[PDB]
């Protein structure tokens, strides 16, 4: 009883921000009751760390026989270096699923 159903990002596609706008990327992952989940992100920039943007707390929900694990990624202000491909990998030890998404930050006033 240690399996993962699917990992989805919200929003999933077509995220578009201006320079200096707050970026938000949640990462839901449905799993079984006994399953533990570990979130590791992958961002294109080299300015931020994994200790800033990724959530320190957790967000879990229980429903009948399915558990939800949620991890958020908050960036206070964005730049051209942040533009690229974001990926949220949710590893349980015995399994690891990942989903991709593209974000665009244009040079324009917010």
């Amino acid at each position, epitope marked *: 009883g240690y399996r993962i159903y699917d990992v989805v990002l919200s929003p999933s596609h077509g995220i578009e921000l201006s320079v200096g706008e707050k970026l938000v990327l949640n990462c839901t992952a449905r799993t079984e009751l006994n399953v533990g989940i570990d979130f590791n992100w992958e961002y294109p920039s080299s300015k931020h760390q994994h200790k800033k943007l990724v959530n320190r707390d957790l967000k879990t929900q229980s429903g009948s026989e399915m558990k939800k694990f949620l991890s958020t990624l908050t960036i206070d202000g964005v730049t051209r270096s942040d533009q690229g491909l974001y990926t949220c990998a949710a*590893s349980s*030890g015995l399994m690891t699923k990942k989903n991709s998404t593209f974000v665009r930050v244009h040079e324009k006033p917010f």
Partner: antibody
Amino acid sequence: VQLVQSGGGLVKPGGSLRLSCAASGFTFSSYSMNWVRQAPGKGLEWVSSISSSSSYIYYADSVKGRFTISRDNAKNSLYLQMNSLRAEDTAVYYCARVTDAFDIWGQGTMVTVSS
Amino acid sequence: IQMTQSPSSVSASIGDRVTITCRASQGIDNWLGWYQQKPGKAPKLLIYDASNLDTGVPSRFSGSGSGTYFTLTISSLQAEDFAVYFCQQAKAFPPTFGGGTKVDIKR
């Protein structure tokens, strides 16, 4: 995409040696890594697993309370310290990437525990 | 959770339709993997989640089945395909492997 192994060799019952597995070709930080062994002639046996940030660790009943799994994500390498070895631990040990199935396997390294 | 492969050995020639069976003790829905191992070197994933082929693997390999019964078919056997084949379950806590099925040269 590669997975090079090293560190294995000869040990006497009770002794211990480090077992390295260096990744290159993909983002190491992200996937869960497992250890699977194969005794000479015998089939495959899952030994241990570990999450991407070393949060969740699991061991088989054959290796629980003796083997210790670990990883350094900065170095992009997987480790496995093997303490209190028995004669039935002599096998070919494989590190492997996990994603649905064990899609990427290391070349393999044989450890020998005999007296 | 036990995985039993049938048969233990299969005699085949080049171009044959070889089928390998893998049976579980309890239901695994669709979480079955297939691996190929040749003597001396490490195993390589052929198929995952029962039917889905891995990248790089030729289309002659195919997988089917669900629950307890599963099957790995090779549509047209080639000289590279002579090797041992293991099935592996991903439902219960400990992922167990099958005993293995050797596909060797008919004689």
